[PDB]
Write an enzyme that holds these catalytic residues in place. Structure first.
Site: not given
Ligand SMILES: Cc1ccncc1NC(=O)CC1CC2(CC2)C1
Ligand SMILES: Cc1ccncc1NC(=O)CC1CC2(CC2)C1
Lengths: 304, 304
Positions: A41, A143, A145
């Site tokens: 993503h 942030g 991820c």
């Protein structure tokens, strides 16, 4: 003496953390050998989030669009590929700090340590359990991820989780290091049902043994039970059914303490039925299910 | 989303851990620059333990009696000195992995991360609070002595604790890195009274703010209180008296949530008086006092 929610030392994992930016999105990547692993993503924009066409989004991206920074130095990206929900960025330099490692897909109920990161920098470490419903109750902000979950056997780091998403319910969802989501989750900004969760029975029993080892024994009673009688109580209280495999894994703790597994189940039965009556066990006023029997043995014997 | 008992990443501290052996005793040492810090009780034997004469015991020891091993390599000891309850072993090699560091003496109620070690090897990491009575409720076994507590501000590691002893009550006692014990404790195998402990009120309030930030708000009520009325409740429940300094430190959390500190105190007052009524706050069925207001701000904002 004492029993803590101990995480593995995060050093070997800190040396693998990098920052990955694509377009305007920055998240964490894991640099092992000459490959950087991160959530796919990272290639999305706010309009794409409700249902991204990852294949189409990745096609508009070239190696030079993936900015990978390991601390202060920039890595040169010479390949990019999407494997399930992860991006694998081939870089021209092998990570000098790559530890001995494995990618493993953990089972529900198993535990692991999370090294929470932001912009490729580590902020903290905590011990988690993969819930029976394949979610984790972590501590993650925008942030985080790409932050990973792992276990360590002497010098080998088994990476088991990569953080991808926060569900509308505040619980977390992610993948193994091959990009396969744990659970039914998809990487989309859509409301997604997590299954009915249950308490990890074998882990609660392991923690009851840890409590006895460390002096907390008020909950030990004059009773015993059977797997079938116990499982009737476990069903009523949303606990996982106990199997002979779980009893077998509790063998070492049963042998150390001299308390038969079914006797410990009877203590758990009474605690489920009557509560704690305002008392605590290992500093907790609830039944703790985030320690596996392996964790209890390890912590209780000082394995490094 | 989510709130965890997060420890600092232990990497910078792992690179400082060494094994120190003197006679038959092996424990952990902390190697910073060309100095190895360890508990002085490493020079003791079982007959000496009830009341060691450390000055006399150290006199029989020469530089070559202190075996310091950093992983697989042996360090050459060129000096030895006793500073309070710590031994400082001067070595001929400066630790290449020495991070930017400070020695700090923390206040009771402050938190820190412990990197538990055995034979100079890290086994796990957990977040602790220095209790008001100067003990810590850690997880330590024989061999863990010399394991350290620390905090990290960006790249600087502030070492605050070195583990020395397990009291007969199963709680832990140790020193700052100058060898000064926190509390009244002495490094002797003698029964030692830890003072009456209290709950760290400011930390519980900080954790109540963290609960509100993360969605747990059932405990918020239609009431308010005063510092004096609240302190009467705090006294009855063995909570530390709240001061204007504590209220001042809670300012950022009060500003973020819009809940006045005295309104939060009134929620805490009702929880103390009525209990949780079988409910939980951030996955806990008791009032958690191991998060400072600084920890809550840091975790809630993702400081790395
Ligand atoms: C905001 C946040 C907080 C904690 N962990 C993670 C996040 N981030 C997200 O969940 C956004 C991702 C999920 C996505 C559709 C594919 C974009
Ligand atoms: C057995 C153990 C367990 C956990 N932490 C620490 C220990 N060790 C000790 O407390 C023994 C030390 C204290 C001394 C008199 C100076 C020898």
């Amino acid at each position: 003496s004492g029993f803590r929610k101990m995480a593995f030392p995060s050093g070997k994992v800190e040396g693998c953390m990098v920052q990955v930016t694509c377009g305007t999105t920055t998240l964490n990547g894991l640099w092992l050998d000459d490959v950087v692993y991160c959530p796919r993503h990272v290639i999305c924009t706010s309009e794409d989030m409700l249902n991204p066409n990852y294949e189409d989004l990745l096609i508009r991206k070239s190696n030079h669009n993936f900015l990978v920074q390991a601390g202060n130095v920039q890595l040169r990206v010479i390949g990019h590929s999407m494997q399930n929900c992860v991006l694998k960025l081939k870089v021209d330099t092998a990570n000098p700090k790559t530890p001995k490692y494995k990618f493993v897909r953990i089972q529900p109920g198993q535990t692991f340590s999370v090294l929470a990161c932001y912009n490729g920098s580590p902020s903290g470490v905590y011990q988690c359990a993969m819930r029976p419903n394949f979610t984790i109750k972590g501590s993650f902000l925008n942030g985080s991820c790409g932050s990973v979950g792992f276990n360590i056997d002497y010098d080998c780091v088994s990476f088991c989780y990569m953080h991808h998403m926060e569900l509308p319910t505040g619980v977390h969802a992610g993948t193994d290091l091959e990009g396969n989501f744990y659970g039914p989750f998809v990487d989309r900004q859509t409301a997604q049902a997590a299954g009915t969760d249950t308490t990890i029975t074998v882990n609660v029993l392991a923690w009851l043994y840890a409590a006895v080892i460390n002096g907390d024994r008020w909950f030990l009673n004059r009773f015993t039970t059977t797997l079938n009688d116990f499982n009737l109580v476990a069903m009523k209280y949303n606990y996982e059914p106990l199997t002979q495999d779980h009893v077998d894994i509790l063998g070492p703790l049963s042998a150390q303490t001299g308390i038969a597994v079914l006797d410990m189940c009877a203590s758990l039965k009474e605690l489920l039925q009557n509560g704690m009556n305002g008392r605590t066990i290992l500093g907790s006023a609830l039944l703790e299910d985030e320690f596996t029997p392996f964790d209890v043995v390890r912590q209780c014997s000082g394995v490094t």
